[PDB]
Design a protein around this ligand. Structure first.
Ligand SMILES: *[C@@H](CC(=O)OC)C(=O)N(c1cncc(Cl)c1)c1cccc(-c2cccc(Cl)c2)c1
Ligand SMILES: *[C@@H](CC(=O)OC)C(=O)N(c1cncc(Cl)c1)c1cccc(-c2cccc(Cl)c2)c1
Lengths: 306, 306
């Protein structure tokens, strides 16, 4: 038992991380087969990052302008191209540590692990959710650009996030690995800002089921509610609507605990209207929304990856 | 910016994890050079784990009674011995993935990363603190015995924990890698229980400094307090005493934020006596005590490992 914010084992991704330097800008790249992927703003200087024309900036570059270091070994760049907001650097060596992988784009509300990196060297691993407003609440300092987010399914790494920038509220924005930003953000320095977020209702319900599996039951009750009646309450507290698909997805957790989904909604309703009255759930005094139903099943059942 | 419960990158440990089977019991082992380390209760059956005589149980075993699998490759056991509560299985192959490592024993209040494993296959990574009562609040299911805890310093893995058992309150107990239990626990089935815990005061102060570094300041005030006066309050709220060494250790964080340590103690005093009045700190509505001053400096400054 127990319930932790648990990341995927990071080894398969550690073996892909490299350092990319262009001019005085150094950041991280992702080395898969004979290509290194990195944020295209590596080619920008201080004054460039104001209002850049990336096509113009890149035609002025040569292969030799990109220094790629994999550990203490230099990788010769033999080609380069832009794909949306990422650079693809062709190198003359295929990464022998390339895992089986996919490039997937995730949905707001889904979770992933982040391998934070500096100078091509991994620093730490943590779990993130993509917020409804397409930001992530990460932990990133200068030099972390190019760090990636991912999930692992058996032996295959599904890369879903490349870090690009920090927004003024201290949250983070980036792209999928095709270089397409998550949300209405751009790789230039503007006054862009996050804008309004909501709480991921299906995940809160998942986490309440995790709590019951782990012996926290004080918030349960005999009442039930209808889906429409619950969604009236969710709207009032800035929770996003619950759908019948969400109810279906919560089916297994409902069957394991014996608590009907709509019954757990009544409990969430009460928790929203009354607070927690000085008690905790799974060691938290807030309603936690960064665990998906899959995350709860994985952790409270125990799936591994090889 | 941002602040997350961040684990060390797990790759160096993933390459050491193996499956150890004796009879019908399967758990995890740690393969370093030509030795596999695992909990000695792998040699016990259901009825054995009641009141076992491990010396008696082990003399009845042969090398061939221990099946060790590293992935899909079987390791031939050529010797075996007991060391306190761990088994050391000599195998005929040195692990080519052995990192530089040390066996260290940590103090209550210190943190480490856990690589949870099942059947020798890594499942997830998370950060843990050793509680004052020598338990850890982990996330472990059946089959997780033998999973290890560790820290990484540059390139060297300091192993500090091997998982053995879950206590009745759902918290976890284990040994250092010399096989000596943390706390007053034994590898037999008794009515043993955790017993009383306290909150790690120096870590809460560290985390308040992390909050200030990250822009949360609402809990600051103009008041100060003396060390003795603060410690009177800490005792009342089940916090452990703060020492002058703790104050010294908080020196760098104090100098970076410009907030005297004793001033932050006054803030903690107010937070204990008034609660948080519906506000949060670093996304928590509770005072967090599982970040050390080192953890805060590492994350809010950005040290990597290679
Ligand atoms: C990358 C900066 C770089 O290329 O060299 C250090 C970087 O990690 N940046 C960052 C990311 N996350 C958090 C923090 Cl505090 C910094 C970063 C630094 C400076 C500018 C930018 C940036 C600005 C506008 C648009 C974009 Cl896409 C990036 C990012
Ligand atoms: C290990 C059990 C094993 O050898 O085969 C599965 C195991 O991981 N156990 C465990 C650990 N953490 C959480 C949970 Cl829910 C289970 C475990 C299972 C059964 C018994 C014991 C045990 C009992 C008394 C003493 C000791 Cl040292 C271990 C652990």
């Amino acid at each position: 038992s127990g319930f932790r914010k648990m990341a995927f084992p990071s080894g398969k991704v550690e073996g892909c991380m490299v350092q990319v330097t262009c001019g005085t800008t150094t950041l991280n790249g992702l080395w898969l087969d004979d290509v290194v992927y990195c944020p295209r703003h590596v080619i920008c200087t201080s004054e460039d990052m104001l209002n850049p024309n990336y096509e113009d900036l890149l035609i002025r570059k040569s292969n030799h302008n990109f220094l790629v270091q994999a550990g203490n070994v230099q990788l010769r760049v033999i080609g380069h191209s832009m794909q949306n907001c990422v650079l693809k650097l062709k190198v003359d060596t295929a990464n022998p540590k390339t895992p089986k992988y996919k490039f997937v784009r995730i949905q707001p509300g889904q979770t992933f692990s982040v391998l934070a990196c500096y100078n091509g060297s991994p620093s730490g691993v943590y779990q993130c959710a993509m917020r409804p407003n397409f930001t992530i609440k990460g932990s990133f300092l200068n030099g972390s650009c190019g760090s990636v987010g991912f999930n692992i399914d058996y032996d295959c790494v599904s890369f879903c996030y490349m870090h690009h920038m920090e927004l003024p509220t201290g949250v983070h924005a980036g792209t999928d690995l095709e270089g397409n930003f998550y949300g209405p953000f751009v790789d230039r320095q503007t006054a862009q800002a996050a804008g309004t977020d909501t709480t991921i209702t299906v995940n809160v319900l998942a986490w309440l089921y995790a709590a019951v599996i782990n012996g926290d039951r004080w918030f349960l009750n005999r009442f039930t509610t209808t889906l429409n009646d619950f969604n009236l309450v969710a709207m009032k507290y800035n929770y996003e609507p619950l759908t019948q698909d969400h109810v279906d997805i919560l089916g297994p957790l409902s069957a394991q605990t014996g608590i009907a989904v709509l019954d757990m909604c009544a409990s969430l309703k009460e928790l929203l209207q009354n607070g927690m009255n000085g008690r905790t759930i799974l060691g938290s005094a807030l309603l936690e929304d960064e665990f998906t139903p899959f995350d709860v099943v994985r952790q409270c059942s125990g799936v591994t990856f090889q």
